[PDB]
Amino acid sequence: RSWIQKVLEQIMDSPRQCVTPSEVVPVTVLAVQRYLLEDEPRDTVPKPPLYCYDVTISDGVYQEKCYLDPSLNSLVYQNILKVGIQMRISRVSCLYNEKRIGQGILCIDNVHCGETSDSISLETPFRNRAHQEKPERPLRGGKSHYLALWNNEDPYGDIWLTDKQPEEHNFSDTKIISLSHLEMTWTNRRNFPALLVRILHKSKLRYYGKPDKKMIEPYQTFLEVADSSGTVSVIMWNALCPEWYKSLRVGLVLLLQDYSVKKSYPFRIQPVPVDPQIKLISTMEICLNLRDPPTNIIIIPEKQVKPEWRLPKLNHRFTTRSELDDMPENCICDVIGLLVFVGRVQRSKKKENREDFWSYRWIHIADGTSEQPFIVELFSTSQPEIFENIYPMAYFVCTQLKVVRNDNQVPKLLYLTTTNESGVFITGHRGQPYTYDAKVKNFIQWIRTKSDSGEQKNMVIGGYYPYPPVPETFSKYSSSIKVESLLTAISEVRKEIEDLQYREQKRIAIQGIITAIKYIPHSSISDRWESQLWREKKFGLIDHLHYSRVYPESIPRKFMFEHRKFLSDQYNSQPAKYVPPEGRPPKLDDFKSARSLGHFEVTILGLNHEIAIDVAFLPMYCPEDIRTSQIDTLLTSMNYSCAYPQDTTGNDRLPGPRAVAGDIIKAATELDRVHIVGILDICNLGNNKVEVYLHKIYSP
């Protein structure tokens, strides 16, 4: 028999009772689906976690979906409870979903997540066939739905339908009034007639679901649509995004018929159209709510489009690196280029809610117009299939990129960022979606010229990439940070490390003195230096923090199209559901390191000589940068270009890695008893793998 069935029979007739199971045999996790925790008593002092998770264990005989007790949510937060792990259940309890007629829900009250399972069989049947239903929904609570395991803007599950194709509708007997006319007469007329518009901007999803509120699929997406008489902001309400979101895209002629015109929202701004001729309507807004007969939205095909209507054409503000160099800040633009680098999918905490996160990742889009790549801060645009599976050597096109500039720092910062109404599309060979635009044709011409010339731009994927480089002087660094939180204590650092969540990144500043720096030939005369101060105070340290370890996934690795899937999966966000690995995968140490140096280990003794720490120094600058003076100092972590070397062909005479390592060690030795201000980078790679890499050493 199966441990699942044994436990179920053991605790089936004692609902909501904590019962240690008779026998504990490891079970295999196969999925972790997240959803909102609702219908629980929030009066409790430890406010219930905002979200709860369902774990789909398997026992070799049957696989059953379990509801993890929210008290254990920290395990999923730190990615300890992965997919395909050998967890052992120490406590179990039953629970009946009164909103449904089914069986008990095995509740995992206590667990001991272990190691990976060598036998991950997804062919096992489901003990409770209700669990194996086509629409994958949460165990508890009416018509509940699942959210993306990490962020709230990524569509996830099966409710997100993608089967809305154009339909031929005859417009005879239809009025299709102009948007300006509607703006004039939306406060008097009763039956708002039809509208023929074209989507010009599609924005990310917005999850406004709150606990203990009678809300069903609380999603809203903002669409800007334009006709021959202006443009308006169209908003899709809950229960409509699931059916239409994955299908609606920019450039689709829609026929909205039964809508609701409201006064518009003052806390949300309407993006300016690419073509200024389009008159902007700001006093009006169109709300699309799900209706009984699904006719409120119709995707009119292009073939039916008549020039007589003169519908506005989807334009684009495509920009090239050279042009971007001359564009003021906050000047929206579009970028088409070749992905020559992709970074980890890091996460940041929303400033509004402490339990929500943004998923972002840095990518160096590049073109033939300049020698520097577009640095784009790619936040999730509710396009997980493209965002998660993005790889170098791909023609990438984003839609709405706000320009961000900072000239105070000596390394002038010029990186683009994705806006709310942005979009991501991967292009293939000649411009697939945007061939007509001349800039796309020029980019394709450059691609062909490079291909026939035998030149290939260097490619990288993943790694430790703290793009924003701290300024050259601590005063300028602190000009933005508050005085009370500017610095921390070497002792308090431990809590900072222990507070981060999956891929949450943090930057802290610590006051101390470099005591001993050691060089670790990383890839496959003096490498260690010790300070007399260290030899004296090493025996009187209260707590010597040891975080000078570099993980294999923090080393950027040169991309290889053949191992594309493996390389991508080694740096994406943790998948929600297990998927068996094709054949055997290679070793993450089997790929060449895009870096060009070995990592050092820096020991810092606090100003009071009581506490110490061991950070790891991971410079990303090549010796050519040293020779041409593209680095503020040898103790920094980035060259000014903030980009990896391209087709390195000039290291024949330049000092080798060992010479640069000796220079770095000597520079560190120059700071013997000097109170320096280190800038550390704390990133938690999940599964209790927190990397603490040094960024900059601000000397007096």
Partner DNA sequence: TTTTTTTTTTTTTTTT
Which residue ranges make up the site for DNA (CB under 7 A)? 190-191, 206, 208, 210, 213, 215, 218, 220, 222, 235-238, 260, 262, 264-265, 267-268, 285, 287, 289, 291-292, 350-353
CB 64 within 8 A of CB 106: yes
Please report, as residue ranges, which positions from 216 to 245 form the binding site for a copy of itself (by CB under 8 A): 216
Distance CA 292, CA 422 (A): 31
x/- mask, a copy of itself, residues 178-217, rule CB under 8 A, reads --------------------------------------x-
Instruction: Give the residue among 397, 497, 378 at the shortest CA–CA distance from 444.
Output: 397
511 makes contact, choosing from a copy of itself, DNA, none, with CB < 5 to 8 Å by partner type, with: a copy of itself
Q: Which stretch binds a copy of itself (CB under 8 A): 93-101, 317-325, 573-581, 590-598?
A: 93-101
* 677 near a copy of itself, judged by CB under 8 A: yes
* 100 near a copy of itself, judged by CB under 8 A: yes
Q: Which is nearer to DNA, 141 or 373 (CB)?
A: 141
* CB-side neighbour CA atoms (13 Å) of 237: 14
* 630 near a copy of itself, judged by CB under 8 A: no
Q: Which is nearer to DNA, 175 or 210 (CB)?
A: 210
Q: Which residues contact 134 (CB under 8 A, 6 or more apart)?
A: 158
Instruction: Give the residue among 124, 96, 146, 115 at the shortest CA–CA distance from 4.
Output: 124
Instruction: Give the residue among 336, 454, 463 at the shortest CA–CA distance from 394.
Output: 336
245 makes contact, choosing from DNA, a copy of itself, none, with CB < 5 to 8 Å by partner type, with: none
Q: Which is nearer to a copy of itself, 216 or 410 (CB)?
A: 216
Q: Which is nearer to a copy of itself, 48 or 373 (CB)?
A: 48
92 makes contact, choosing from DNA, a copy of itself, none, with CB < 5 to 8 Å by partner type, with: none
Q: Which is nearer to DNA, 260 or 479 (CB)?
A: 260
Please classify residue 591 by burial: count the beta carbons closer than 10 Å to its beta carbon, then call 0-12 exposed, 13-18 middle and 19+ buried.
buried
Distance CA 262, CA 283 (A): 9
* 689 near a copy of itself, judged by CB under 8 A: no
Q: Which residues contact 11 (CB under 8 A, 6 or more apart)?
A: 17, 19, 21, 92, 93, 94, 104, 106
The residue from 44, 46, 351, 483 that contacts a copy of itself (CB under 8 A) is 483
Q: Which is nearer to DNA, 91 or 206 (CB)?
A: 206
Cα angle, residue 594 at apex, residues 591 and 595 outer, rounded to 5°: 125
Q: Which is nearer to a copy of itself, 331 or 487 (CB)?
A: 487
Question: In whole angstroms, how close is the CB of 482 to a copy of itself at the nearest point?
Answer: 8
**Cβ count near 551 (within 10 Å):** 14
Instruction: Give the residue among 548, 669, 684 at the shortest CA–CA distance from 612.
Output: 548
At 301, list the tokens: 């095909």
3-state secondary structure of 451: helix
CB 338 within 8 A of CB 330: no
Question: In whole angstroms, how close is the CB of 552 to a copy of itself at the nearest point?
Answer: 33
The residue from 352, 484, 582, 652 that contacts a copy of itself (CB under 8 A) is 484
Q: Which is nearer to DNA, 222 or 434 (CB)?
A: 222
* 109 near a copy of itself, judged by CB under 8 A: no
Three-class secondary structure assignment of 55-69: EEEECCCCEEEEEEC
Instruction: Give the residue among 116, 134, 114 at the shortest CA–CA distance from 126.
Output: 134
Distance CA 494, CA 498 (A): 6
* 143 near a copy of itself, judged by CB under 8 A: yes
Q: Which residues contact 408 (CB under 8 A, 6 or more apart)?
A: 471, 476, 479
Cα angle, residue 625 at apex, residues 624 and 631 outer, rounded to 5°: 160
Q: Which is nearer to a copy of itself, 454 or 540 (CB)?
A: 540
CB 621 within 8 A of CB 639: yes
Q: Show the beta-strand stretches assigned E in 260-306.
A: 260-262, 280-288, 299-300
CA distances from 75 to 53, 58, 59, 227, 392 (A): 11, 19, 21, 51, 33
Question: In whole angstroms, how close is the CB of 405 to a copy of itself at the nearest point?
Answer: 24
Question: In whole angstroms, how close is the CB of 8 to a copy of itself at the nearest point?
Answer: 15
Please report, as residue ranges, which positions from 569 to 608 form the binding site for a copy of itself (by CB under 8 A): 606-608
Question: In whole angstroms, how close is the CB of 199 to DNA at the nearest point?
Answer: 17
Instruction: Give the residue among 488, 696, 516 at the shortest CA–CA distance from 604.
Output: 516
* 476 near a copy of itself, judged by CB under 8 A: no
Q: Which residue has the tokens 């095995």?
A: 106
306 makes contact, choosing from a copy of itself, DNA, none, with CB < 5 to 8 Å by partner type, with: none
The residue from 21, 24, 88, 96 that contacts a copy of itself (CB under 8 A) is 96
Q: Which is nearer to DNA, 501 or 630 (CB)?
A: 501
* 9 near a copy of itself, judged by CB under 8 A: no
Please report, as residue ranges, which positions from 412 to 471 form the binding site for a copy of itself (by CB under 8 A): none
Number of residues near a copy of itself (by CB under 8 A): 29
The residue from 15, 114, 586, 650 that contacts a copy of itself (CB under 8 A) is 15
Question: In whole angstroms, how close is the CB of 252 to DNA at the nearest point?
Answer: 20
Question: In whole angstroms, how close is the CB of 289 to DNA at the nearest point?
Answer: 4
Q: Which is nearer to DNA, 222 or 578 (CB)?
A: 222
CA distances from 677 to 459, 624, 699 (A): 34, 27, 7
At 367, list the tokens: 């073109």
229 makes contact, choosing from a copy of itself, DNA, none, with CB < 5 to 8 Å by partner type, with: none
Q: Which is nearer to a copy of itself, 15 or 585 (CB)?
A: 15
Q: Which is nearer to DNA, 87 or 236 (CB)?
A: 236
Say if strands 333-342 and 318-319 run parallel, antiparallel, or are unpaired. Answer: parallel
436 makes contact, choosing from DNA, a copy of itself, none, with CB < 5 to 8 Å by partner type, with: none
* 45 near a copy of itself, judged by CB under 8 A: no
Q: Which amino acid would we find at residue 36?
A: L
The residue from 19, 113, 393, 487 that contacts a copy of itself (CB under 8 A) is 487
3-state secondary structure of 163: coil
The residue from 21, 60, 142, 166 that contacts a copy of itself (CB under 8 A) is 142
3-state helix, strand, coil split of the chain in percent (to 5) is 15, 30, 55
Q: Would you tell me which residues interact with a copy of itself (CB under 8 A)?
A: 13, 15-16, 95-96, 98-101, 142-143, 216, 474, 483-490, 511, 606-610, 673, 677
